[PDB]
Amino acid sequence: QVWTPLNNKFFETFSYLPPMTDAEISRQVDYIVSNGWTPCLEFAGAESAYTSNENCVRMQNTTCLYYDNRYWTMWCTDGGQVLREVQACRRAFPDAYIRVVGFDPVRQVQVSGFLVNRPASVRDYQGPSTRSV
Amino acid sequence: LTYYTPDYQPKDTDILAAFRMTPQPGVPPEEAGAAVAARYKGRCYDIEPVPGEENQYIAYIAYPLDLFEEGSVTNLFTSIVGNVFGFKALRALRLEDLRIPPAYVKTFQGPPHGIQVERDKLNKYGRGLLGCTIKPKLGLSAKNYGRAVYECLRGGLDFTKDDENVNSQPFMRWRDRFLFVAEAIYKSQAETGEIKGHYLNATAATAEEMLKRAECAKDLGVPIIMHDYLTGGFTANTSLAHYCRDNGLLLHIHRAMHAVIDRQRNHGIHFRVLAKALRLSGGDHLHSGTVVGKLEGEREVTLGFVDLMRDDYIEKDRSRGIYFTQDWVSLPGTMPVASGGIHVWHMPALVEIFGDDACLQFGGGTLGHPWGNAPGAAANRVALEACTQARNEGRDLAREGGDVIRAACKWSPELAAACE
Amino acid sequence: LTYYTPDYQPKDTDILAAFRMTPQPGVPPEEAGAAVAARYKGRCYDIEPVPGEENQYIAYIAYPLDLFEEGSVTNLFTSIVGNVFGFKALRALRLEDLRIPPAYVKTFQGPPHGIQVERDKLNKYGRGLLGCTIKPKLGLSAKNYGRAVYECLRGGLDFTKDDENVNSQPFMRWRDRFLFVAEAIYKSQAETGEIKGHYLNATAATAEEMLKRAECAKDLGVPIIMHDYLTGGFTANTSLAHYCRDNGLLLHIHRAMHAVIDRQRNHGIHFRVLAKALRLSGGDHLHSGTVVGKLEGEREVTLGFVDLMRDDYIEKDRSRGIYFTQDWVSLPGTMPVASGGIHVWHMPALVEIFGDDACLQFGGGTLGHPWGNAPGAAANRVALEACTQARNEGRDLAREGGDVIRAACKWSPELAAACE
Amino acid sequence: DKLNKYGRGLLGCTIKPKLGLSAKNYGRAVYECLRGGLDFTKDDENVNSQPFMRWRDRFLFVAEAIYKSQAETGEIKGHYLNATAATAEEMLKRAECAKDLGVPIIMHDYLTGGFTANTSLAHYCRDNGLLLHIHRAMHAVIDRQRNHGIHFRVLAKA
Amino acid sequence: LTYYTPDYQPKDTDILAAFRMTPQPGVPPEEAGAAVAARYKGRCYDIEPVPGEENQYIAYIAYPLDLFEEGSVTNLFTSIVGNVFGFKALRALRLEDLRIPPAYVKTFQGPPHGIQVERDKLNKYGRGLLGCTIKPKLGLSAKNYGRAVYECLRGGLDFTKDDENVNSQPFMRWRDRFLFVAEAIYKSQAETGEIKGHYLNATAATAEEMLKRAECAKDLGVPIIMHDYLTGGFTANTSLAHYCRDNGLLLHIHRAMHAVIDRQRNHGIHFRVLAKALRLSGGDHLHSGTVVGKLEGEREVTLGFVDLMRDDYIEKDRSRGIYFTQDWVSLPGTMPVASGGIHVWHMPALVEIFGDDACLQFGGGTLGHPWGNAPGAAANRVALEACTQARNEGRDLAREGGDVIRAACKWSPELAAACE
Amino acid sequence: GGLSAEQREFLERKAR
């Protein structure tokens, strides 16, 4: 079989697994909470979801390690609350990818980041069986 | 003995070494420790015999901080192990550990970015990184090398790397390879939407040539380069690490020629000291182990030097080979890179042993997947993500790795052709 | 075995290695040689057993010339001994010799000046050179270091040198030492009328700092600098050697950390390979032996690597450890430097063993002469000149060294206080 | 004229927490505050270059945040990047990085860095078209007591 | 004769020359060879008479490798043919061939990219390249020159080139031409989707000006430049080739003033020696022949120097003028460029003679197509592709070239107006 | 672990 290079976009962690269900998202959020970390939600439409070099035109010397759309837009006690917020974000922005992020409150660093929602309207991604043709 | 002072209390600024030495018969251990030790004099303050070994002792030496040049791994190695392995009074001598006082650590820049800055720059969290060594090792043209890089990266791999002996040869000059690899990296980035990279080998004959190759990598905008620090030298490595910090480049470190110094148990320098010297000199990644069949070497020793090269504060643990408490005073950590034959069903073991802050390298070049390079990379990525997800759910990977692999294979056609 | 080809005839451009390997029991020697060997493939073409050793064999490997980067000792060592000492199938492995084909040799600059250009620049002919290591090793201020240098040089010594661990410390910064040593060198030159020099240590943390120290030495007009190539690295050494050729500076090379790689007979890289790598990378002098009591190590082995690092054409001689004929195609030779406890009555032996093309180093700092540093230097110079004159007359030094020393002492008051 | 903002005061925020935040999280906070409608954000006065957040990582992440907020809102945005450093060479290098990123404005502590360093930075900013925000750290040590010291108005004129 | 040694066996590192000499009557051939030959002495080791010529002999001279400066074609030509064509004892003298030992070859960088790297960079495989010389030769403004370049490239030509005498004149300054040609190249690339190029003439009065023109070409991002090596000089050429390797630029070489040295059979230097000197100095393309009517010159001689400038290993073949076996030890090959009146029906002959690794140049400026420059370029491209396809099918081009051309013309309206 | 007489003898000296 051949890995398809057409409409096969991916979003880093857990993006190569089948779309996670509510129970799986809940278990991941519980894992984040268990470690002592804070979960939050990021979202972006299809125009600002993938990495790009749009602003590299303004730079000189080098553009090493600079990529656009690394930041998404921010949307935290347990899995159920984060799931409710996931549904709320889905209703508010149906054409936007949702990403669950984790933040270590002591080190003040991001420790987690996995996609939990892919807009049905957008078709820039494949499915577990359509990834190979 | 003016140089054996068992009542001496080491200062907070002393550099401490733990030597495993086997003196010649008739030489008392106190005399041998005094010799190794011999205001600016090194002194043996502690000698312990090794229970279960033949005439083997651990000698603890304290060196004053004024003895060394600030921020110079070269000087540190010249002072500590310059001419001490040639003493006739010692049948065998092995440096086991070093204690770098914070006062000395603060004089070093350290790794250019570290693990957390690397994760933030690459926007990858919660999982180990994946890499492949482009194979065949040599003979491939820059165009074909770039084609292989693009094929492996588009599958889902986060990194690819040049072979350790690929610097600049008649078959493939370095600038052609850099250009074709840059095109491949950018194509794979556009196709998958994830940030990709390739460990471009900057190891060269002269520091000027090495800096020129780093400069070309910086001008292409590519993320990361590679260096052979034990063959290029600490002086060349430190220059490259300073350059990478200045210009925002990641630095992968390969430990070529390491077994010539850290293989024999009785003679040489233990890899943990070389790992601490690398972290001081600078490196974002450091090839730290081989997985032939399984992770080779005592697990505790591996865990010890992985913690020594990763954490900020490592307490003394003789079980794992930590002879001294090591405070890193906020020096950036180095990401360990486990390479070799990482088979798909062996991923759960390595994910359990290393965790998320490591790079698993398929130095075998994969190619074992009947479909191609890209599906093989996808299978590996699927397996790693499935193992990580299972571990996050509370599963015991060492007991359910096969079950997790099978369950992932049930829905992954690419992994199905890999699991067979 | 695709990699064991006993009928293969090595090409005139192949790089040849002679490995002394002890395979694990049950592993045939042909299989182990095939593994070490494994168009661009290294191949084992010859295996000979070591008569008088336990399961020890010499494996001859042929590498194609296209495998290596032109003028890069770093790449050569990465390719040959990068990851081969870590093979589990080998109980022990030792690289004994290398054959550098002329085609490869011509891609290297080599030593900046060589022996003959050194003699012409220093205007010293027909005798060995003399040097001292300023002692105490550390703690001395730049002013006092310069005073010691001037006192030792005015006596008749041709060179002095910084201690191997003296680079730049709180007690003595490097630029102060360079300035005071320059004043001392010029004072001793004016006083004696002979050209003097001091091995200024340029070994530093970064290549930039090392080049800055070399630049300061060039701006002072002093003749020679020093480098630690096994700790600084081949990349740093090659940069320094290119700089020294460009700016007309001599380069003394110290082999710090050598015993960590060339001491054990079963594992490591023999010093002769490190000496050939140094000659390729560049160095006018290379500390080549210690004289504790007497010249240590098998004489034939020492003579072998001295000839390998000095002569232009060395024929294969297994008695002296030459496993391959080495053609240097007019590459400048490196002057061997024998250091350690060179006592006055031991000068005839070393003059006989080394001849005129060597530097005898009093690394003990002398100080054994009751009168002072300067008369001790004079005594040494008188002894060396008397031994050379006796050898030129047809005397057998190994049999009449004591007679020659006594006869010189009969007229030398300085040597009289030294001979006691 | 450069910022195309007329008829109103400008608005700025100091990214908080003061210290401990990673360059990524600092950039995230900058982007979140700027996208709301703020014209400027600024580094904390004591944020120059620390083990927790090196200066070049912060400059890069802040540049990405500034450009994202500009694209989202359509208004020109900026962040007072702290160029205050130990040596004039390091300070000019940080200003040079800001110039190479195309970001609008940098910051300096003139009473702690010194007038000599400030004048060099101001000449550089005029030469390269960069705005310069000045923070008066250590001012109360000289302009607080009514009987002794130098009144702030003299420091403002200087 | 101390310089005629018929029993001498040339070394593997000797530089060998084969001189065709006609001595004055009364001078024996052995004496004349001894004179040309006259540890560092050149020696005549072999003399053979030319069967079928009047008093003509081939003298073989062996020069030691130490005689020449590493990587210097200038020195090689100064040593070999500096002052030997002015000997009164020789009626005529002609250097026929040179043997460059691998040891010497390794000291040269060679062509910046070579044939295979060129093909990979341009992404063109399996066919010869096509070029045109913009005509009229002179008088055209930079704007009109660019217009002609764009019109010829959009038709399907891979390259265009400046006239040999077009460097920088009042009618067309060089920077205006570079800018307009860059615009034309980019327009043609966007229109056709194939990578295009134009041989920009960097030949200038001073090396500084030549490097400035190369720098402008590099700043425009254009692929290739041109140089006149026999008029600019080997020193200027070697500088340009090093620059092109450093900055990733292709280098086309034009052999202006060649007939002044390689035309007469009795006196001068044969073009094959100039081609080997160019390959050593550096050049990706080398104008190698003219096709006035048909490929001019003995086919075997042309094939010989084409193989000498293309292949890695050329065995001695006196039938094709190869007097010595030439090992290139992986030096990049040079692409031969056949220029002149390449008419459409003459394409099969040149495709058969040269193969795919050559550039056919329409130095006549085409313009013979009644429709325009672009359709004429298309006709040429169609003819070349049809001939290549026929050759790949097993057709005999020398016998079916007309049939293939007619068959291609049956479906190509552009070729129909060209075939008439 | 087992310490040889020498190692044990050294221990006694270190104790003294």
Automatic annotation (TrEMBL), chain A:
Report the locations given in the UniProt record: Membrane; Plastid, Chloroplast
Spell out the protein name for this chain.
Ribulose bisphosphate carboxylase small subunit, chloroplastic
Which family does this protein fall into?
Belongs to the RuBisCO small chain family.
Q: Tell me the organism.
A: Chlorella sorokiniana (Freshwater green alga)
Q: What else is known?
A: The basic functional RuBisCO is composed of a large chain homodimer in a 'head-to-tail' conformation. In form I RuBisCO this homodimer is arranged in a barrel-like tetramer with the small subunits forming a tetrameric 'cap' on each end of the 'barrel'.
Q: What is the lineage of its organism?
A: Eukaryota, Viridiplantae, Chlorophyta, core chlorophytes, Trebouxiophyceae
Query: What's this protein's function?
Result: RuBisCO catalyzes two reactions: the carboxylation of D-ribulose 1,5-bisphosphate, the primary event in carbon dioxide fixation, as well as the oxidative fragmentation of the pentose substrate. Both reactions occur simultaneously and in competition at the same active site. Although the small subunit is not catalytic it is essential for maximal activity.
Subunit structure and binding partners: Heterohexadecamer of 8 large and 8 small subunits.
UniProtKB/TrEMBL annotation, chain D:
User: Which sites bind Mg(2+)?
Assistant: 42, 44-45
Function comment: RuBisCO catalyzes two reactions: the carboxylation of D-ribulose 1,5-bisphosphate, the primary event in carbon dioxide fixation, as well as the oxidative fragmentation of the pentose substrate in the photorespiration process. Both reactions occur simultaneously and in competition at the same active site.
Q: Where in the cell is it found?
A: Plastid, Chloroplast
Additional free-text comment from the UniProt record:
The basic functional RuBisCO is composed of a large chain homodimer in a 'head-to-tail' conformation. In form I RuBisCO this homodimer is arranged in a barrel-like tetramer with the small subunits forming a tetrameric 'cap' on each end of the 'barrel'.
- Superkingdom classification of source: Eukaryota
Question: Which residues are annotated with the PTM N6-carboxylysine?
Answer: 42
Family per similarity comment: Belongs to the RuBisCO large chain family. Type I subfamily.
Q: Which organism is it from?
A: Chlorella sorokiniana
Source lineage = Eukaryota, Viridiplantae, Chlorophyta, core chlorophytes, Trebouxiophyceae
Section of the entire sequence shown? 160 to 317 of 475
Report what the protein is called.
Ribulose bisphosphate carboxylase large chain
Q: Where is the active site?
A: 16, 135
Note the subunit structure: Heterohexadecamer of 8 large chains and 8 small chains; disulfide-linked. The disulfide link is formed within the large subunit homodimers.
Query: Which gene name belongs to this protein?
Result: rbcL
